[PDB]
């Protein structure tokens, strides 16, 4: 690939936290330890609102599938549902007892999971806001969690040093350094871990075994978003403490490119939902979201 930058977003004042793209590929969402949700075009990175309401930093902030909700996770102990149009809270999900780290809608987007350093996972019903499990998923704070195609499992990651993946519909486990980010593949078949030891694995979770090994970038103290690309060639893409955005051929394993320009770790990337176009984001040295665009 050729991602070359074309827009910095700046606004937020403190750390950012994780940048999004909406389903619809029009909106980029940004969270910060500033306590606000801001929301850019995702193709000129043009300043669009901000959403205030958390009482402390926001950790995470994620889309349901419409394009037309944002739920984020807060310090504060609470998730907050948006409604993006008027950035408006439309609920807020209590019972976490410690700060929440991380959040994501199943694709139906009738739930929401979240993770927090009290060590457990949720699951919420986005229609009542009300909590329907409390999984007692880890012991160690809960560094993500994702749904997979369907909504049917849960993928958790924690300091404790594990992955777990959870059968949504009960809560029970099905299969079990700091592992410092998780996500189902597109396809559902592949969990990409990230462990506190500079290294990502892609990992066959229906076999249990480890297919592929990325290192080369600097991971050892931040949880770091990582993600699949697969609007164009098949990359693997990361932040990294060194300030860089890395890309990895899935296939290979070997760096295809690494993105220089922020200032401060690189604590989250993300990637169009159809256009080879990446968001990266940065703590307090920076705190600029940097759109970067590729040929291919
Ligand atoms: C996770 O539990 C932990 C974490 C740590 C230290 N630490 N390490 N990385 C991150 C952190 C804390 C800060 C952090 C934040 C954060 C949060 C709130 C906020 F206002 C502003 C920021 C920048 C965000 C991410 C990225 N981010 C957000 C959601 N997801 C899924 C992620 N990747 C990462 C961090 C220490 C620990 O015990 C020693 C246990």
């Given amino acids: 690939p050729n991602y070359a930058l074309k827009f910095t977003l700046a606004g937020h004042t403190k750390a950012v936290s994780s940048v999004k793209f909406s389903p619809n590929g029009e909106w980029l969402a940004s969270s910060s330890a500033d306590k ?5 075009g995702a193709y000129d990175g043009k300043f669009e609102k901000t959403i205030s309401g958390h009482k402390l930093g926001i950790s995470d902030v994620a889309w349901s599938s419409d394009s037309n909700l944002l739920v984020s996770a807060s310090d504060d102990k609470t998730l907050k549902i948006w409604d993006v149009s008027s950035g408006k809270c439309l609920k807020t999900l209590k019972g976490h007892s410690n700060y929440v780290f991380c959040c994501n809608f199943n694709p139906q987007s009738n739930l929401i999971v979240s993770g927090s350093f009290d060590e457990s996972v949720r699951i919420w019903d986005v229609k009542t ?11 160690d704070p809960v560094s993500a969690v994702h749904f997979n195609r369907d909504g049917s499992l849960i993928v958790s ?3 404790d040093g594990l992955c777990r993946i959870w059968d949504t519909a009960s809560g029970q486990c099905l299969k079990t350094p700091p592992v410092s980010f998780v ?3 597109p396809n559902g078949k592949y969990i990409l871990a990230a462990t506190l030891d500079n290294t990502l694995k892609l990992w066959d979770y229906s076999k249990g075994k480890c297919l592929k090994t990325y290192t080369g970038h600097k991971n050892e103290k931040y949880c770091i978003f990582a993600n699949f690309s697969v609007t164009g060639g098949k990359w693997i893409v990361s932040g ?4 860089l955005v890395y890309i990895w051929n899935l296939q290979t394993k070997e760096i295809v490119q690494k993105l220089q320009g922020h200032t401060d770790v690189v604590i989250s990337t993300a990637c169009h939902p159809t256009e080879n176009i990446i968001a990266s984001a940065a703590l307090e040295n920076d705190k600029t979201i940097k759109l970067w665009k590729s040929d291919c």
Avoid: R, V
């Fill in 157 to 159: 990651s924690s300091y």
């Fill in 240 to 243: 990294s403490e060194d300030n």
């Fill in 36 to 40: 606000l949700i801001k929301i850019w």
């Fill in 129 to 139: 806001g009300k909590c329907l499990k409390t999984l007692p998923a880890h012991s």
């Fill in 183 to 185: 996500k189902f593949s």
